[PDB]
């Protein structure tokens, strides 16, 4: 019927900003745009006890970081860009991600060692 | 407070690959996954009539694919990655980023065009109302 009222973006060189997949294609601001998101995002899903999501977007967030972190255009305005993305921020997503990490590791080995026993069990049962 | 069954996963090393960001440390077959996830949006999106959100996933779809088409190991595994990936939708990106762009192309300057007349036309009348008077 009627298209959604428009809402995403003004033009269609902002919302071609989106479509993009090479850093050398995505700016700064971009970056800074996404990580914003991505770490809303991944605050969501640890609250809601998604522990894999929730360590994909912290361990996303940090990579962008550390990418445009490199950049002389994010070097050059360091102070600005760390007040948008705040400080408190970029370290909790590391020690998010590294408590993730640790609890993830022994949920994959657990997952897997009981998947062991229990083929084992099978063997021996019917016998 | 229990943690959601998993389900992303099956090792911290498959979920790392997640975490990418440069397509250099991003394999062929990643980008396929996200690619089948990115056009499912997409057609998600077009069936909200949701536009510009269409538009943007249908480009990005097109885009992963014209940057994995290019690899040596895309390449010689070209039939395959075909017959994953769905040699329609691939066709369907295509037009539909076409089609969506030349929509919003219009929309867009329909609604910078319909805000400048409002304005000019709020202050005429305005205008006219204060004069009026006197």
Redo the contacts between chains.
Sequence with gaps: ????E???????KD??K??????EKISTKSYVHSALKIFKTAEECRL??????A??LY??YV??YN?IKKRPDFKQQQDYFHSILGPGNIKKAVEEAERL?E???L??EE??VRKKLEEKDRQEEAQ
């Design positions: 019927s009627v298209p959604k428009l809402y995403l973006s003004s033009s269609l919302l071609n989106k479509t993009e997949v090479k850093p809601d006890r998604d522990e894999e999501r360590y994909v361990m996303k990579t962008v990418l990490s609890s993830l590791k949920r994959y997952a897997e």
